């Protein structure tokens, strides 16, 4: 499944470069890892991956 990876708190991982997400996503078994909306997004994550199901979340 696709979505944005979150930290131990459940907040989307901010991304500043595509290469950064590419590697991260890959480690999470993802195929489309890139930086978008200032947030990392992987395509192909596991159905049990920890990501946010909303493009408009607020960590805090």
Swiss-Prot record:
GO CC list: extracellular region
SMART domains given in the database record: Knot1
Cellular localization per UniProt: Secreted
A Pfam family of this chain: Toxin_3
Cysteines joined through disulfide linkages: 11-59, 15-35, 21-40, 25-42
PROSITE patterns per UniProt: LCN_CSAB (PS51863)
Domain LCN-type CS-alpha/beta intervals: 1-59
Primary role: Binds voltage-independently sodium channels (Nav) and inhibits the inactivation of the activated channels, thereby blocking neuronal transmission. Is highly toxic to insects and barely toxic to mammals. As it does not compete with the classical alpha-toxin AaH2, this toxin is considered as an alpha-like toxin.
Descriptive protein name: Alpha-like toxin CsEv5
Lineage: Eukaryota, Metazoa, Ecdysozoa, Arthropoda, Chelicerata
